[PDB]
Amino acid sequence: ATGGYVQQATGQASFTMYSGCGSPACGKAASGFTAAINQLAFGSAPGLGAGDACGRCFALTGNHDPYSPNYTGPFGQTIVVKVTDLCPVQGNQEFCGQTTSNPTNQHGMPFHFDICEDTGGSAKFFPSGHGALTGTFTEVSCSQWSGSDGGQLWNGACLSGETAPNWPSTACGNKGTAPS
Numbered sequence: 498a499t500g501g502y503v504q505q506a507t508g509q510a511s512f513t514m515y516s517g518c519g520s521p522a523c524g525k526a527a528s529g530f531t532a533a534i535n536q537l538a539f540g541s542a543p544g545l546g547a548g549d550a551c552g553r554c555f556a557l558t559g560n561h562d563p564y565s566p567n568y569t570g571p572f573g574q575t576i577v578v579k580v581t582d583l584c585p586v587q588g589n590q591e592f593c594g595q596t597t598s599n600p601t602n603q604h605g606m607p608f609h610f611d612i613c614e615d616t617g618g619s620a621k622f623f624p625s626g627h628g629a630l631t632g633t634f635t636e637v638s639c640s641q642w643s644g645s646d647g648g649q650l651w652n653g654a655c656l657s658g659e660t661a662p663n664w665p666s667t668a669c670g671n672k673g674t675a676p677s
């Protein structure tokens with residue numbers, strides 16, 4: 498996409514969970530299940546505001562524990578998250594280090610979703626004792642997402658991806674150039 502970001506409506510991803518998504522990089526939180534997506538897919542860098550991932554909805558499915566490869570299941574449920582946040586390259590090399598010259602993370606995944614624990618998404622997705630998974634994602638209509646957006650936290654906050662057709666398309670728009 499514009500800026501060299503890798504923004505595809507379906508693919509393979511790794512998955513983690515994080516705490517504190519009340520002030521996310523898109524500039525609006527949301528009451529439903531939400532996630533951060535890795536910088537290369539988010540469409541912006543730290544401090545540059547919302548990228549074109551902002552507010553898009555994705556169905557996530559975990560099917561492998563890379564830390565416990567002998568574990569055959571059960572995994573969690575497929576959940577639908579709204580992207581509100583950025584998992585930046587800086588400080589997240591294992592999972593969010595995808596760059597245009599090296600587009601997979603240390604688990605070979607081209608995308609990563611960091612699922613917010615606060616609003617319940619990770620409890621539906623991660624079996625107890627299994628904090629990181631790999632699997633698949635598919636962008637879906639936000640008709641499939643339960644919840645309401647929070648208010649703007651600053652000028653330029655954007656979740657307009659929630660009404661956009663699936664990638665390839667433009668809503669909030671990408672900022673700057675993808676990390677190389």
Ligand SMILES: OC[C@H]1O[C@@H](O[C@H]2[C@H](O)[C@@H](O)[C@H](O)O[C@@H]2CO)[C@H](O)[C@@H](O)[C@@H]1O
Nearest residue numbers: 512513514515516584589592611628629
């Ligand atoms: O770095 C992305 C993401 O990781 C989260 O911690 C992971 C950790 O990286 C992984 O090694 C462990 O097995 O599972 C935890 C939880 O999923 C961390 O909570 C996030 O803040 C961070 O953005």
